[PDB]
Design a protein around this ligand. Sequence first.
Ligand SMILES: CC(=O)N(CC#Cc1cccc(C(N)=O)c1)C[C@H]1C[C@@H](n2ccc3c(Cl)ncnc32)[C@H](O)[C@@H]1O
Length: 270
Amino acid sequence: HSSGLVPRGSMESGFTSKDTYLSHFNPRDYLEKYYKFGSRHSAESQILKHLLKNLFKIFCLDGVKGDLLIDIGSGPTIYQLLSACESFKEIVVTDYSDQNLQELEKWLKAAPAAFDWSPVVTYVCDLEGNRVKGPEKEEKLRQAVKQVLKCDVTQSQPLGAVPLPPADCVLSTLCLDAACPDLPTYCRALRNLGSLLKPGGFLVIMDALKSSYYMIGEQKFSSLPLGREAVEAAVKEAGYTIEWFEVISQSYSSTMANNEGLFSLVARKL
Ligand SMILES: CC(=O)N(CC#Cc1cccc(C(N)=O)c1)C[C@H]1C[C@@H](n2ccc3c(Cl)ncnc32)[C@H](O)[C@@H]1O
């Protein structure tokens, strides 16, 4: 323990170790901190609002759609799946943190103590032209998530021995910056993720730019600080062609992250 000097579980290697996410990452503190849609004019809400807007553009407006979408790094969050749910018959959510899976499974069964995503669901519904309502939307997403699996991006087999068909798309929101301690592992993880993709399948990555850390209240966690070029290069190296690539200037509040914006991209496997 370093008390804010360095991120938790990082004094030895410099990067927050994987095991720190099984112990100190409290998903309910994370949800309450980063995904409260109460004040819609907060720097966090603006990030989430742009994530959804981009997810809406990829999944409802563009052509990213198919049988299987593997979500890598789901965290305790389901916002990243609201738009994809309209485009994929089956979604698979994955994450390293058991507590994250724990909170995910509470929402998948609509338990009362589960985090309330209803204000977030409504905004997406608006983006989708209000063809549905809040409750109908959640049920559709809940019906499409067929598996809740362990995940490890540092393994050649990221979803373990679990046999899945090749997915049409792979989606990772705010995962690789926290998971990959360096660029070679970042590049390698992107290569392992491709082992789950149909040839010519889509890869969708939205993460922070130039972020050495991010805050969960007083708990600091390591993030890999990446420029657009470092991202673009690691992706192309992993066996991908970048179809489009966006970079935004909006950043998290000074109390929450030192990132210099966010990036979003769609890439296909060669
Ligand atoms: C998906 C999310 O919401 N996560 C919480 C945040 C955030 C956040 C928010 C704002 C800015 C930034 C930033 N500055 O970048 C990060 C991260 C994820 C990472 C994930 N993790 C950790 C190791 C690991 C392995 Cl080895 N393999 C697969 N997943 C793994 C672990 O489970 C957890 O859920």
